[PDB]
Structure 1
Amino acid sequence: QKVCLICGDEASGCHYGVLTCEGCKAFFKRAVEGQHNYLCAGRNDCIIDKIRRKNCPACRLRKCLQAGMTLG
């Protein structure tokens, strides 16, 4: 049973360099290529799991970057 390194949910394989779920795969794609302005409502250390990963795109993207995800 493989686990997403960002939200801890079931992973479907390695995406963009890192073992991730379908959600975090598609999110990282949109986040990097889009012109988004994410701002954490907390302290830039939010819990990112299956239920709360929608809550803070800022911390979700930060975890993607710190885990080493790259489009190429």
Structure 2
Amino acid sequence: QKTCLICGDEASGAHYGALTCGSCKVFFKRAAEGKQKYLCASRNDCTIDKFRRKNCPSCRLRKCYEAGMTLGA
């Protein structure tokens, strides 16, 4: 079972250095590049699952970085 390391959906491949779904690979590019500072409404430890991944952009981006995601040098 190929699985997004960030939200648990099916992965679609290895994107930006990590096994992710298509939703999370495009979020990462948008977030890591954007000029939109994401502040968590709680504790910087929200649960990122495939039903609530849109809830906290800050915690989703954090889980992307901790999964090894990167914009490739």
Give the aligned partner of residue 28 of structure 2.
Answer: 28
> Runs of 5+ in structure 1 lacking a partner?
none
What is the TM-score of this pair, normalised by structure 1? 0.96
Q: Equivalents in 1 of 2:71, 2:34: separation in Å?
A: 13
Give the aligned partner of residue 7 of structure 1.
Answer: 7
Cα deviations across residues 5-32 of structure 1 (Å, max 9, x unaligned)? Answer: 0001100110000000000000000001
**TM-superposed deviation, 1:42:** 1.1
Give the aligned partner of residue 62 of structure 1.
Answer: 62
Cα deviations across residues 31-71 of structure 1 (Å, max 9, x unaligned)? Answer: 01110110101111101011110000000000001111011
What is the TM-score of this pair, normalised by structure 2? 0.95
- How many residues end up aligned between the 2 structures? 72
Backbone CA RMSD of aligned residues: 0.6
Give the aligned partner of residue 46 of structure 1.
Answer: 46
Identical positions, percent? 78
Q: Equivalents in 1 of 2:11, 2:67: separation in Å?
A: 14
Code of the residue aligned with 2:7 in structure 1: it is C
